[PDB]
Design an enzyme around this catalytic site. Structure first.
Site, PDB file in Angstrom:
ATOM      1  CG  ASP A 102       7.183 -18.969   5.574  1.00  0.00           C
ATOM      2  OD1 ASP A 102       5.971 -18.978   5.225  1.00  0.00           O
ATOM      3  OD2 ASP A 102       7.668 -18.063   6.284  1.00  0.00           O
TER       4      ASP A 102
ATOM      5  CG  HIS B  40       7.381 -14.124   1.950  1.00  0.00           C
ATOM      6  ND1 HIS B  40       7.960 -13.076   2.597  1.00  0.00           N
ATOM      7  CD2 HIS B  40       6.848 -14.900   2.902  1.00  0.00           C
ATOM      8  CE1 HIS B  40       7.773 -13.204   3.882  1.00  0.00           C
ATOM      9  NE2 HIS B  40       7.116 -14.311   4.092  1.00  0.00           N
TER      10      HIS B  40
ATOM     11  CB  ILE C   3       8.291  -8.449   1.436  1.00  0.00           C
ATOM     12  CG1 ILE C   3       7.657  -9.367   2.469  1.00  0.00           C
ATOM     13  CG2 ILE C   3       7.300  -7.312   1.092  1.00  0.00           C
ATOM     14  CD1 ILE C   3       7.095  -8.655   3.659  1.00  0.00           C
TER      15      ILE C   3
ATOM     16  N   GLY D   7      11.881 -12.746   6.146  1.00  0.00           N
ATOM     17  CA  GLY D   7      12.866 -12.249   7.092  1.00  0.00           C
ATOM     18  C   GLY D   7      13.960 -13.265   7.381  1.00  0.00           C
TER      19      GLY D   7
END
Lengths: 301, 302
Positions: free
Chosen positions: A202, A207, A222, A225
């Protein structure tokens, strides 16, 4: 231009996915295996084996890599459009039918498992069934639930469109029990956690790219998840399953708040029969970021 | 001679299963389709179609035929023996991933899902995963739970062996709500119901032979539990699912008491979200014979 018949009858194309033991180890390090101790007997088996890397064990959340691509690429559905950049990943649901091998060629059958008109957003649920090419056996099944912002309003407000083509109890939010947790486990993520974890597939700039994450409303990029999910399930494997990843039968994870690489994740666990109920918090900002359950194997020995 | 590891590593051989649209219709008649009305629009689609029998619809409990054979032959597990004639069928659990076709060639992969030492009996649970030969897709999964009388005591009674290799909520007994049922449907079974239903595959003399059934503890031959289950799920399809068998995603049935062919089955249903909770009674003797649940598809446009 939205017809439910056409959409329910639509067949999504199948996918191939190939991985090897190096991919397995990079994932495991990406979700923190041996992050605090190089010689951790419980976690060393995820990244090394004396008799060859092909004998390492796979962490069950690795199966979440088998979905990658569909939702963010586009995924054209008859009579239903959406903006992939405003997509939010709401929950992940995984069922593991057989222990995951350290290398495989998969055929992924994909299907629309759910769609709801929620006014301004739509909820979409995609199922990926991953068959091993050699045996033909179904290894696992993923259900991805995305919150499609701006995608609502395609049906009549008198009867908003709601479609659920799976057993509704799967992934249901389970209440955190009122008692104290059975076990609490705490682990710090590395400042570079997202930069390593994204090499598993990903590559979302959210991120990794500071400017891009600012334009999304965040002071630094970030953590994925699904990386957070990997940390939590790893903790459950260590603290409840006596180190055995094959004890994990189902994984439900509901995403709540953002995590930043370098923060410390605290996972609290409760045991309700053979269901582990869990919750993960960021220690520094004292916010709950993840909650769900794990169904585990029962074995008296 | 019992080791838990050797048993858990053991792999059971796979099987093949083939059926056609005639097998489907014989099954559907075996569980009462059109039993009360030949022109019932709701149920005629299970046994007849204007454009050819291959376009009939399959009742989901048909998937329970894909397990037949396994437990009753013997099935040798390392370090665990049992007497197949003392076998009792406790519950059935079915998951339907795609609507069942009217003809198919299947590969059934079989696996040991659970084993419990219950003192003098053992509980054994077998999983069958049915793959369609052409597509390779998983059509459905069955979990069969049998109580094997006389088979207990194979582990140390100091720590009785318990093994469950699946999510434990599946097939859990669900409490009947204290309110009144949403819908009740009742259907008489035919006196010859078991003689017809056994032609779908289960030829056990317990459902056809008067002398054999007496020697098992029954005054007349008893109806197959899976036949009763077919009646209950059919009732739910007509009374909750508007007649659409593809609305059924999960089936749990726990067998409780014996049913005799010719008795009248009453099915009470409650709705808790997209889970139908159900119970079946024999009208004549006012006894509960079956209980479980059905998870159904949610679709607002129906």
């Amino acid at each position: 231009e939205f017809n439910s018949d056409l959409l329910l009858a639509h067949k999504l194309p199948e996918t191939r996915y190939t991985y090897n033991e190096r991919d397995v180890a990079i994932y495991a390090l990406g979700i923190g295996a041996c992050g605090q101790d190089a010689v951790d007997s419980d976690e060393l088996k995820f990244v090394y084996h004396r008799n060859g890397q092909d004998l390492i064990q796979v962490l069950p959340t690795f199966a979440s890599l088998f979905t990658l691509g569909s939702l963010t690429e586009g995924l054209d559905l008859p009579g239903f459009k959406y903006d992939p950049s405003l997509l939010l990943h709401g929950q992940q649901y995984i069922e593991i039918y057989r222990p995951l091998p350290s290398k495989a060629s998969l055929i992924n059958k994909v299907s629309l498992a759910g769609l709801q008109d929620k006014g301004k957003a739509a909820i979409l649920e995609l199922e990926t069934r991953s068959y091993e090419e050699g045996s033909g056996e179904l290894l696992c099944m993923n259900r991805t639930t995305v919150f499609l912002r701006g995608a609502g309003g395609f049906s009549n407000s008198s009867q908003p469109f709601s479609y659920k083509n799976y057993p509704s109890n799967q992934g249901l939010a389970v209440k955190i029990p009122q008692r104290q947790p059975l076990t609490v486990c705490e682990e710090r993520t590395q400042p570079s956690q997202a930069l390593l974890y994204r090499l598993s597939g990903d590559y979302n700039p959210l991120h990794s790219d500071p400017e891009f994450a600012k334009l999304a409303g965040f002071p630094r990029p970030i953590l994925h998840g699904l990386c957070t999910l990997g940390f939590a399930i790893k903790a459950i494997i260590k603290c409840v399953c006596k180190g055995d990843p094959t004890a994990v039968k189902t994984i439900s994870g509901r995403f709540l708040t953002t995590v930043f690489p370098g923060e410390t994740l605290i996972t609290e666990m409760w045991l309700e029969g053979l269901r582990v109920i869990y919750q993960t918090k960021v220690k520094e900002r004292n916010k709950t970021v993840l909650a769900g359950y794990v169904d585990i194997r029962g074995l008296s020995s």
